[PDB]
Coordinates of C-alpha atoms (C1' of nucleotides) in Angstrom, one line a residue:
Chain P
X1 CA 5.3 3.5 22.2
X2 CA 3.9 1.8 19.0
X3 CA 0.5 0.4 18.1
X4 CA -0.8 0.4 14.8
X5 CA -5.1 0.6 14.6
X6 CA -7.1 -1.4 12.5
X7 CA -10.2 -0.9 11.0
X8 CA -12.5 -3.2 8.7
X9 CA -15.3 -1.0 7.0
X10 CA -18.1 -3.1 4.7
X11 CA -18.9 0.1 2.0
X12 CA -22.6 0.0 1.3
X13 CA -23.4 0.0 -2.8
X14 CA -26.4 1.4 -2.5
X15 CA -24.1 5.1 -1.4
X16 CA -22.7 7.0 -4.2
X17 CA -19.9 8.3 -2.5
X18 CA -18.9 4.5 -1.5
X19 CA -19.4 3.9 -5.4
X20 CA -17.0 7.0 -6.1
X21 CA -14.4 5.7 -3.8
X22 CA -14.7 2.1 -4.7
X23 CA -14.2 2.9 -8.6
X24 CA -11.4 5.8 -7.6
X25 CA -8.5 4.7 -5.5
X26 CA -7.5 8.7 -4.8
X27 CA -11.3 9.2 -3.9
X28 CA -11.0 6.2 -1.3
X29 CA -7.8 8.0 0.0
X30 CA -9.3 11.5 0.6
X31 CA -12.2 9.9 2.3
X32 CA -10.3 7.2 4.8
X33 CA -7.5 10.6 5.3
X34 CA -10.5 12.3 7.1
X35 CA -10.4 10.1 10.2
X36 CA -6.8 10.5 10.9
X37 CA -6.8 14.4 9.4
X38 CA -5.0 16.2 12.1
X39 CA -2.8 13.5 12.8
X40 CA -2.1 13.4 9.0
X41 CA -1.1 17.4 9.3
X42 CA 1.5 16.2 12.3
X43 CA 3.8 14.4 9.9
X44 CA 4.0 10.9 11.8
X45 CA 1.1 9.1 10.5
X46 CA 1.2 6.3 7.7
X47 CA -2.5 5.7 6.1
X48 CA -2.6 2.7 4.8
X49 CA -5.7 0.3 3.6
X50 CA -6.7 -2.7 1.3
X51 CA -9.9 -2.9 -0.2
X52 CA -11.1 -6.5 -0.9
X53 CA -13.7 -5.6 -3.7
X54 CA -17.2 -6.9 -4.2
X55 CA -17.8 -10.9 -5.4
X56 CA -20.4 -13.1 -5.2
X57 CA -22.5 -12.5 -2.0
X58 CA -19.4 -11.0 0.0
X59 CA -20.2 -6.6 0.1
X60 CA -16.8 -4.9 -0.7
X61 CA -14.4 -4.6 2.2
X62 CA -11.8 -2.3 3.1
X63 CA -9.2 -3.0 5.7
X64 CA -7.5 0.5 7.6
X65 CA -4.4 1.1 9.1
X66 CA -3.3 4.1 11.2
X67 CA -0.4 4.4 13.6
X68 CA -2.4 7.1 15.8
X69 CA -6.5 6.6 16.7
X70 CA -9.2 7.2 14.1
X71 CA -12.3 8.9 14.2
X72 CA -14.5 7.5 12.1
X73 CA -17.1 9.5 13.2
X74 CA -16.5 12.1 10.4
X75 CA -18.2 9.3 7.9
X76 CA -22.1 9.7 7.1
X77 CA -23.5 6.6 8.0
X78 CA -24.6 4.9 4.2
X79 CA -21.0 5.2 3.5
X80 CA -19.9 1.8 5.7
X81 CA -20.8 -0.5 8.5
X82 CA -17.8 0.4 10.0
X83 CA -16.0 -1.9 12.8
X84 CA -15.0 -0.7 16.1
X85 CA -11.3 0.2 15.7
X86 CA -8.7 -1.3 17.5
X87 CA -5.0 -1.2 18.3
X88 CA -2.4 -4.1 17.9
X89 CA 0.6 -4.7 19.3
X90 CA 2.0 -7.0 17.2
X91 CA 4.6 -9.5 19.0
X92 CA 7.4 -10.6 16.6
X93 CA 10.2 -12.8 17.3
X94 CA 13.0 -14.2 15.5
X95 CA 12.3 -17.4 13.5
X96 CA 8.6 -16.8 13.9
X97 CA 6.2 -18.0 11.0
X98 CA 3.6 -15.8 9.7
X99 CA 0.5 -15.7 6.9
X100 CA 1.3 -12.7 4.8
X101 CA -1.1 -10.9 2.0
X102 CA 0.0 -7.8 0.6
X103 CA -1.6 -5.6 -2.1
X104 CA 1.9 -4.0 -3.7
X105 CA 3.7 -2.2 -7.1
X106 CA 6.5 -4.1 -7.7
X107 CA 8.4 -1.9 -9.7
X108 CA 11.4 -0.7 -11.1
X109 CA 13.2 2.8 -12.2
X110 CA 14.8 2.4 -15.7
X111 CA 18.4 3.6 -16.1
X112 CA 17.7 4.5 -19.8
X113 CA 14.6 7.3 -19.4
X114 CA 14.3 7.3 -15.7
X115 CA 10.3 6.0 -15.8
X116 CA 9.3 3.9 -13.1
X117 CA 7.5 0.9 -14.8
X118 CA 6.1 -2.4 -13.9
X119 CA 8.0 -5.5 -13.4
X120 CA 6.7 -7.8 -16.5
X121 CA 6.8 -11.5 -15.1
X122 CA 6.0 -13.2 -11.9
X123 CA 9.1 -14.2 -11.8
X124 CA 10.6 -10.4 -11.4
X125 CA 7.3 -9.8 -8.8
X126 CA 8.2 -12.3 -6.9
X127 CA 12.0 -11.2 -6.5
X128 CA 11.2 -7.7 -5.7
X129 CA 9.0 -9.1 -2.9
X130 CA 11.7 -11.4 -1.7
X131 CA 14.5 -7.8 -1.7
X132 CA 12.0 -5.5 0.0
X133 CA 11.1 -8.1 2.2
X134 CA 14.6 -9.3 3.5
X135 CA 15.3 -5.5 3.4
X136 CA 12.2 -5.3 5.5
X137 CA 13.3 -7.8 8.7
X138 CA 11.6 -10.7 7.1
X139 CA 12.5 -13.5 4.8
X140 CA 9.9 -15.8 2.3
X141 CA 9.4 -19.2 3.2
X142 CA 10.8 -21.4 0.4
X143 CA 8.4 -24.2 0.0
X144 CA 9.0 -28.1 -1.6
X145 CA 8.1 -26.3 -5.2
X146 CA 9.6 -22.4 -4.7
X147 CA 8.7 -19.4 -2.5
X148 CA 5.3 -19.4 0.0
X149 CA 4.3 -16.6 -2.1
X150 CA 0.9 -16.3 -4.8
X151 CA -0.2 -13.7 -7.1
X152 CA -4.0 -14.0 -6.6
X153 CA -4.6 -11.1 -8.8
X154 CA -2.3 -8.5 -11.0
X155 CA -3.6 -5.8 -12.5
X156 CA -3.0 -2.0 -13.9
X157 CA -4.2 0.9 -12.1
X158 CA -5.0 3.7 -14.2
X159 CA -6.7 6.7 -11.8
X160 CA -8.0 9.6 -13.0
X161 CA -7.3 13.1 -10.9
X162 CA -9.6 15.8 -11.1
X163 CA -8.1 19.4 -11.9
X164 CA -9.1 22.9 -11.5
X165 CA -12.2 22.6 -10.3
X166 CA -13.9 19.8 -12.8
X167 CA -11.1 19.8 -15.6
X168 CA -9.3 16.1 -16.3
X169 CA -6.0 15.9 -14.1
X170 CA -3.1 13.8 -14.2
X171 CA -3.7 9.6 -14.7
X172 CA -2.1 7.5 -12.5
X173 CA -0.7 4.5 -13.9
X174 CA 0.2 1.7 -11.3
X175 CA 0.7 -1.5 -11.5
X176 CA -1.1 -3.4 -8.7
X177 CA -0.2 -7.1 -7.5
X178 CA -2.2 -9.2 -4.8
X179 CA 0.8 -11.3 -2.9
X180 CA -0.5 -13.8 -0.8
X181 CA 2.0 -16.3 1.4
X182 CA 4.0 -17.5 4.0
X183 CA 7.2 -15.7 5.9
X184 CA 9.7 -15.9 8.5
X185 CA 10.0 -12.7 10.8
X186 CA 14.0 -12.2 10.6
X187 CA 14.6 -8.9 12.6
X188 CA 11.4 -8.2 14.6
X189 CA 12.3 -4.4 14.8
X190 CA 12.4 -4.1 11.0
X191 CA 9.3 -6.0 10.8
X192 CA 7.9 -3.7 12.8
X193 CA 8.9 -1.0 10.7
X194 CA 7.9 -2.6 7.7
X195 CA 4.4 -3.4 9.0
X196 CA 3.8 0.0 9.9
X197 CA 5.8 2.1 6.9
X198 CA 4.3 -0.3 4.5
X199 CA 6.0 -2.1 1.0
X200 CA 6.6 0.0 -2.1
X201 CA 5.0 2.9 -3.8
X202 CA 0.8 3.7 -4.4
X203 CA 0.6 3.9 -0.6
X204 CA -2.2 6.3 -1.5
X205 CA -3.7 4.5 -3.7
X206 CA -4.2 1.2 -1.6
X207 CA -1.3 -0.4 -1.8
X208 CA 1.5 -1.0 0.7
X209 CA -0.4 -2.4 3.7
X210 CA 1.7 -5.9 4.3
X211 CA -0.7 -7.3 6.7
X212 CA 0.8 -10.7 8.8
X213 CA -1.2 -13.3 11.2
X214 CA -0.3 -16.4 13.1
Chain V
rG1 C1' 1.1 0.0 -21.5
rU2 C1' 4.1 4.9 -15.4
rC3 C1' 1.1 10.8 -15.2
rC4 C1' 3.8 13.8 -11.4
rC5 C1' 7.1 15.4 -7.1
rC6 C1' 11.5 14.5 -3.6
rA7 C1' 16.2 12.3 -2.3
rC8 C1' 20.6 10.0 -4.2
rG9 C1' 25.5 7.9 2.3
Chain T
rG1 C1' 19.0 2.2 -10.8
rU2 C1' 17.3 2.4 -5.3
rG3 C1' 13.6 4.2 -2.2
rG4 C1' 10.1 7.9 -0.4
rG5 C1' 5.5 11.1 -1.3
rG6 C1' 1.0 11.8 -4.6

RNA sequence: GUCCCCACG
RNA sequence: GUGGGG
């Protein structure tokens, strides 16, 4: 019995807590957490979400997933023009070709000091896409020239926590990498998985959500 | 430029 | 080194 919901919310500048959460990527989490709360306490949910940050005339724009139905209502309006929520089903079949985008850390744990660190090169982002993709039920579409996979955007997270009341807290350093391409659905029931548990770590901190359409 | 916690069939 | 949670 699976659907995953979807929700698109447009955060309104003018609000400062929409300012909070769109320069804090823990503050964001905190606030989307609230509509799925008590499912969040029942140990099955996976929050996910992308924000698509403000350019040009387009307002910024954050893109939900939840496995179980939000309630958005817990938002004060000023905070987001938020879209009607709704479930998908998605439909997945061997062979099938899909548009992927994906927001992701590709990382890797060093054997020397045990730090998890960034992957340096494309080249090394790419492949850890390709592994936890395959891994995942799905396969990249190799093109005439390489992989259907672009990095639109690559850049390092570094998120300050708040402590004891209003002391400075722990900073968390991610490295975050904006995938954009083409795949082939392999195994339909790990793809399902995959689109629901989500790709690699920062989960919480807006990374993860492997979104797929036709 | 990885701050922390968990597992290691 | 692989993944998960923050």
């Amino acid at each position: 019995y699976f659907q995953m919901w979807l929700t698109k919310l447009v955060l309104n500048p003018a609000s400062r807590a929409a300012r909070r959460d769109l320069a804090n990527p823990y503050e964001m989490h905190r606030t989307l957490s609230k509509a799925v709360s008590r499912a969040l306490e029942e140990g099955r949910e996976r929050l996910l979400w992308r924000l698509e940050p403000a350019r040009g005339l387009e307002p910024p724009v954050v893109l939900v997933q939840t496995l179980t139905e939000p309630d958005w209502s817990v938002l004060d309006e000023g905070y987001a023009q938020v879209f009607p929520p709704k479930p998908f089903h998605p439909a997945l079949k061997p062979g099938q070709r899909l548009r992927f985008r994906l927001r992701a850390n590709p990382a890797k744990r060093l054997a020397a000091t045990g730090k998890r660190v960034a992957l340096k090169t494309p080249a090394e982002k790419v492949a850890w896409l390709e592994r936890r993709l395959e891994e995942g039920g799905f396969r990249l579409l190799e093109g005439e020239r390489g992989p259907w996979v672009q990095i639109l955007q690559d850049t390092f997270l570094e998120v300050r926590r708040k402590k004891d009341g209003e002391e400075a807290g722990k900073l968390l350093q991610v490295q975050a990498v904006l995938f954009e391409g083409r795949l082939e659905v392999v195994d339909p029931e790990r793809a399902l998985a995959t689109l629901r548990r989500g790709v690699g770590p920062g989960k919480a901190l807006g990374l993860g959500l492997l979104s797929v359409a036709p």
